[PDB]
Design a protein around this motif. Structure first.
Motif, PDB file in Angstrom:
ATOM      1  N   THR B  14     -90.809  12.795  -6.926  1.00 57.68           N
ATOM      2  CA  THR B  14     -90.905  11.449  -7.446  1.00 57.68           C
ATOM      3  C   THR B  14     -90.658  10.621  -6.360  1.00 57.68           C
ATOM      4  O   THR B  14     -91.225   9.432  -6.335  1.00 57.68           O
ATOM      5  CB  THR B  14     -90.240  11.106  -8.639  1.00 57.68           C
ATOM      6  N   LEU B  15     -89.433  10.460  -5.679  1.00 57.96           N
ATOM      7  CA  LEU B  15     -89.111   9.659  -4.670  1.00 57.96           C
ATOM      8  C   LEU B  15     -89.176  10.389  -3.129  1.00 57.96           C
ATOM      9  O   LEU B  15     -89.654   9.609  -2.352  1.00 57.96           O
ATOM     10  CB  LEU B  15     -87.425   9.220  -4.564  1.00 57.96           C
ATOM     11  N   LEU B  16     -88.579  11.411  -2.995  1.00 58.70           N
ATOM     12  CA  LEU B  16     -88.709  12.172  -1.476  1.00 58.70           C
ATOM     13  C   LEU B  16     -89.991  12.771  -1.475  1.00 58.70           C
ATOM     14  O   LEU B  16     -90.282  13.537  -2.324  1.00 58.70           O
ATOM     15  CB  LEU B  16     -87.424  13.058  -1.517  1.00 58.70           C
ATOM     16  N   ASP B  17     -90.438  12.873  -0.155  1.00 67.78           N
ATOM     17  CA  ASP B  17     -91.823  13.364   0.508  1.00 67.78           C
ATOM     18  C   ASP B  17     -90.995  15.011   0.676  1.00 67.78           C
ATOM     19  O   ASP B  17     -90.354  14.978   1.709  1.00 67.78           O
ATOM     20  CB  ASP B  17     -92.327  12.915   1.390  1.00 67.78           C
ATOM     21  N   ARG B 188     -88.280   6.156 -22.837  1.00 63.76           N
ATOM     22  CA  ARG B 188     -89.581   5.811 -22.225  1.00 63.76           C
ATOM     23  C   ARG B 188     -89.933   6.688 -21.030  1.00 63.76           C
ATOM     24  O   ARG B 188     -89.026   6.848 -20.203  1.00 63.76           O
ATOM     25  CB  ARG B 188     -89.686   4.288 -22.009  1.00 63.76           C
ATOM     26  N   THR B 189     -90.965   6.814 -20.885  1.00 62.36           N
ATOM     27  CA  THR B 189     -91.562   7.618 -19.686  1.00 62.36           C
ATOM     28  C   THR B 189     -92.557   7.009 -18.906  1.00 62.36           C
ATOM     29  O   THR B 189     -93.497   6.446 -19.548  1.00 62.36           O
ATOM     30  CB  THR B 189     -92.224   9.204 -20.211  1.00 62.36           C
ATOM     31  N   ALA B 190     -92.166   7.101 -17.512  1.00 66.02           N
ATOM     32  CA  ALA B 190     -93.324   6.725 -16.425  1.00 66.02           C
ATOM     33  C   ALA B 190     -93.863   8.010 -15.614  1.00 66.02           C
ATOM     34  O   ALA B 190     -92.708   8.526 -14.968  1.00 66.02           O
ATOM     35  CB  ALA B 190     -92.916   5.555 -15.625  1.00 66.02           C
ATOM     36  N   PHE B 191     -95.026   8.435 -15.584  1.00 70.65           N
ATOM     37  CA  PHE B 191     -95.519   9.573 -14.784  1.00 70.65           C
ATOM     38  C   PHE B 191     -95.928   8.876 -13.478  1.00 70.65           C
ATOM     39  O   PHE B 191     -96.858   8.195 -13.588  1.00 70.65           O
ATOM     40  CB  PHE B 191     -96.506  10.579 -15.628  1.00 70.65           C
ATOM     41  N   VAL B 192     -95.246   9.441 -12.305  1.00 72.24           N
ATOM     42  CA  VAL B 192     -96.013   8.966 -11.055  1.00 72.24           C
ATOM     43  C   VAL B 192     -96.753  10.289 -10.702  1.00 72.24           C
ATOM     44  O   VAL B 192     -96.300  11.257 -10.153  1.00 72.24           O
ATOM     45  CB  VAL B 192     -94.743   8.920  -9.982  1.00 72.24           C
ATOM     46  N   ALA B 193     -98.214   9.826 -10.420  1.00 76.60           N
ATOM     47  CA  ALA B 193     -99.188  10.957 -10.067  1.00 76.60           C
ATOM     48  C   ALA B 193     -99.285  11.350  -8.896  1.00 76.60           C
ATOM     49  O   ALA B 193    -100.375  11.263  -8.253  1.00 76.60           O
ATOM     50  CB  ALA B 193    -100.417  10.519 -10.944  1.00 76.60           C
ATOM     51  N   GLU B 195     -99.599  13.948  -5.434  1.00 71.15           N
ATOM     52  CA  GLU B 195    -100.576  15.247  -5.144  1.00 71.15           C
ATOM     53  C   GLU B 195     -99.930  16.427  -5.823  1.00 71.15           C
ATOM     54  O   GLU B 195     -98.780  16.590  -5.490  1.00 71.15           O
ATOM     55  CB  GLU B 195    -100.647  15.152  -3.874  1.00 71.15           C
ATOM     56  N   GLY B 196    -100.802  17.046  -6.381  1.00 71.02           N
ATOM     57  CA  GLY B 196    -100.659  18.612  -6.982  1.00 71.02           C
ATOM     58  C   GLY B 196     -99.522  18.632  -8.281  1.00 71.02           C
ATOM     59  O   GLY B 196     -98.933  19.696  -8.490  1.00 71.02           O
ATOM     60  N   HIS B 197     -99.547  17.461  -8.974  1.00 73.16           N
ATOM     61  CA  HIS B 197     -98.702  17.451 -10.113  1.00 73.16           C
ATOM     62  C   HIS B 197     -99.488  16.989 -11.376  1.00 73.16           C
ATOM     63  O   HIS B 197    -100.231  16.065 -10.945  1.00 73.16           O
ATOM     64  CB  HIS B 197     -97.549  16.705  -9.987  1.00 73.16           C
ATOM     65  N   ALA B 198     -99.453  17.906 -12.314  1.00 77.33           N
ATOM     66  CA  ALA B 198    -100.389  17.463 -13.532  1.00 77.33           C
ATOM     67  C   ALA B 198     -99.054  16.826 -14.766  1.00 77.33           C
ATOM     68  O   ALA B 198     -97.959  16.881 -14.583  1.00 77.33           O
ATOM     69  CB  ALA B 198    -101.109  18.538 -14.197  1.00 77.33           C
ATOM     70  N   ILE B 199     -99.844  16.456 -15.711  1.00 75.78           N
ATOM     71  CA  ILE B 199     -99.193  16.130 -16.974  1.00 75.78           C
ATOM     72  C   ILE B 199     -99.158  17.445 -17.839  1.00 75.78           C
ATOM     73  O   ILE B 199    -100.520  17.878 -18.078  1.00 75.78           O
ATOM     74  CB  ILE B 199     -99.792  14.792 -17.683  1.00 75.78           C
ATOM     75  N   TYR B 200     -98.183  17.630 -18.657  1.00 75.82           N
ATOM     76  CA  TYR B 200     -98.067  18.578 -19.490  1.00 75.82           C
ATOM     77  C   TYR B 200     -99.079  18.384 -20.621  1.00 75.82           C
ATOM     78  O   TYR B 200     -98.578  17.579 -21.601  1.00 75.82           O
ATOM     79  CB  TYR B 200     -96.716  19.068 -19.704  1.00 75.82           C
ATOM     80  N   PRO B 201     -99.935  19.178 -20.986  1.00 71.96           N
ATOM     81  CA  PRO B 201    -100.884  18.710 -21.984  1.00 71.96           C
ATOM     82  C   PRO B 201    -100.284  18.742 -23.415  1.00 71.96           C
ATOM     83  O   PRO B 201    -100.768  18.235 -24.379  1.00 71.96           O
ATOM     84  CB  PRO B 201    -102.218  19.911 -21.792  1.00 71.96           C
ATOM     85  N   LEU B 202     -99.492  19.632 -23.841  1.00 72.91           N
ATOM     86  CA  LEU B 202     -98.686  19.791 -25.055  1.00 72.91           C
ATOM     87  C   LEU B 202     -97.698  18.822 -25.410  1.00 72.91           C
ATOM     88  O   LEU B 202     -96.536  19.111 -25.180  1.00 72.91           O
ATOM     89  CB  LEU B 202     -98.189  21.330 -25.034  1.00 72.91           C
ATOM     90  N   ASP B 203     -97.964  17.674 -25.673  1.00 72.41           N
ATOM     91  CA  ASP B 203     -97.234  16.546 -26.279  1.00 72.41           C
ATOM     92  C   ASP B 203     -96.511  15.953 -24.937  1.00 72.41           C
ATOM     93  O   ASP B 203     -95.181  15.564 -25.284  1.00 72.41           O
ATOM     94  CB  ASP B 203     -96.340  17.107 -27.399  1.00 72.41           C
ATOM     95  N   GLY B 204     -96.901  15.963 -23.523  1.00 70.10           N
ATOM     96  CA  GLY B 204     -96.325  15.548 -22.382  1.00 70.10           C
ATOM     97  C   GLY B 204     -96.843  14.368 -21.986  1.00 70.10           C
ATOM     98  O   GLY B 204     -96.427  13.848 -20.780  1.00 70.10           O
ATOM     99  N   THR B 205     -97.615  13.666 -22.629  1.00 68.10           N
ATOM    100  CA  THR B 205     -98.356  12.403 -22.201  1.00 68.10           C
ATOM    101  C   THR B 205     -97.176  11.375 -22.284  1.00 68.10           C
ATOM    102  O   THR B 205     -96.574  10.875 -23.146  1.00 68.10           O
ATOM    103  CB  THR B 205     -99.453  11.856 -23.448  1.00 68.10           C
ATOM    104  N   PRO B 206     -97.144  10.611 -21.019  1.00 64.42           N
ATOM    105  CA  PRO B 206     -96.062   9.592 -20.807  1.00 64.42           C
ATOM    106  C   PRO B 206     -96.490   8.384 -21.414  1.00 64.42           C
ATOM    107  O   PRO B 206     -97.853   7.922 -22.006  1.00 64.42           O
ATOM    108  CB  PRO B 206     -96.029   9.462 -19.405  1.00 64.42           C
ATOM    109  N   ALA B 210     -98.934   5.934 -13.459  1.00 70.95           N
ATOM    110  CA  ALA B 210     -99.244   5.195 -12.200  1.00 70.95           C
ATOM    111  C   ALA B 210     -99.158   6.249 -11.163  1.00 70.95           C
ATOM    112  O   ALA B 210     -98.866   7.313 -11.174  1.00 70.95           O
ATOM    113  CB  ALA B 210     -98.243   4.111 -11.860  1.00 70.95           C
ATOM    114  N   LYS B 211     -99.663   5.800  -9.844  1.00 66.65           N
ATOM    115  CA  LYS B 211     -99.981   6.770  -8.814  1.00 66.65           C
ATOM    116  C   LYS B 211     -98.671   6.759  -7.693  1.00 66.65           C
ATOM    117  O   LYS B 211     -98.556   7.755  -7.127  1.00 66.65           O
ATOM    118  CB  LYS B 211    -101.177   6.201  -8.242  1.00 66.65           C
TER     119      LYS B 211
END
Lengths: 221, 221
Positions: B14-17, B188-193, B195-206, B210-211
């Protein structure tokens, strides 16, 4: 070496050859590593569900994690094709060594039970296809405990149901984590060194190591 | 949208490359999928440790799981080599967007904290090297809660310590399971999209997608 009264077998990989599923995923996503990354994601999210106080049947998590995994490989398969690929979970033949190994162990008057992450119905379909159902006195699903392996309550529920103490029970698994969990539940452990599976180096050393279930049977007899 | 009183940031992605560690591993094992498999294996065994009533520092599980992963790519790296590759965890630079995002949020008088699976010492070293330490009022290690994310107790330990309610706290994470964990702890959730990370389709929608962390900061203000 003292004989165990009860043997608990992992099913997926330990007994069942994942080849039909492994090949179907690897060739649909165009990588030899596609299956490994997906299955490890499936196992990770199965432990995520348990630690977040929720249960989802294995097949469902499998489908969700396959959709997540296919995007890392730049593919976007239709739902018809995802279902066709996953369908191979029900069509996994037994490893060539298992039937002889189980026959030998059941003949020595050892209780044989299965404990799988698969839900009750999937586990039944899996073992009927491979013709392994008749070898086991009892078949345990994590549905029948609510919590995925390697949570300690999964092993202990099988102990108290079969009326065999932990020290007289031996867990047979091709998974380092399944060895680690059983070991911390008080069980003896036999690691089946199937291709592409390693022992967890952090206190995950089993009592026995062998290359096939047949080999495990021979070492105990 | 309501402005949150507290923002909790995942650290390792989320923060470190992860670039330096990802490249060190993929080179050494000779595959672009080696990092993905190893890191997923690391996370899997981390939750395995928690579910079997044990804690091991994140660095140790990383080494053990790397020894397991290298065998699966037909390599046998020396301990010198493994330590050199794993050393990169301490030398991860911030993503370009982070410092500007964090500054914007800190000026808006929002309490910023980190929550990482890394042990306290490692987490301190990582944020010092990336020059991110001074942006956070506090930095929570899972060592400071006994249990790995996404166990609900890990997020709630931050809420209670920072004296902020769950509904006024937003978790920022590039991990689908870290979103799921926080969501089910009432945050409350913020997903940082990334590279190579997906949202968990089973009730994991934030709540927010954002990118970059910078895009998250702009969306909130």
């Amino acid at each position: 070496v003292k004989k165990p009264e009860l043997l608990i077998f992992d099913v997926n990989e330990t007994l069942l050859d994942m080849g039909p599923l492994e090949n179907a995923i690897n060739e649909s996503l165009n990588s030899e590593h596609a299956f490994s990354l997906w299955f490890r994601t499936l196992l990770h999210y199965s432990l995520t569900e348990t630690l977040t106080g929720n249960y989802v049947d294995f097949g469902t998590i499998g489908k969700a994690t396959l959709k997540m995994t296919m995007r890392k490989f730049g593919k976007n398969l239709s739902e018809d094709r995802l279902d066709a690929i996953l369908g191979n979970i029900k069509k996994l033949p037994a490893h060539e060594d298992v039937k002889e190994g189980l026959k030998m162990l059941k003949e020595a008057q050892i209780k044989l039970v299965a404990l799988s992450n698969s839900n009750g119905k999937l586990l039944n379909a899996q073992l009927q296809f491979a013709g392994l159902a008749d070898y086991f006195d009892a078949i345990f699903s994590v549905e029948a405990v609510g919590r995925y392996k390697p949570e300690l309550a999964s092993y202990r529920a099988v102990l108290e149901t079969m009326k065999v103490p932990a020290e007289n029970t031996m867990m047979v698994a091709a998974n380092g984590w399944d060895i680690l969990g059983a070991k911390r539940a008080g069980l003896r452990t036999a690691f089946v060194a199937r291709e592409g599976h390693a022992i967890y180096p952090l206190d995950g050393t089993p009592e026995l190591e062998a290359k096939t279930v047949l080999e495990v049977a021979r070492t105990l007899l």
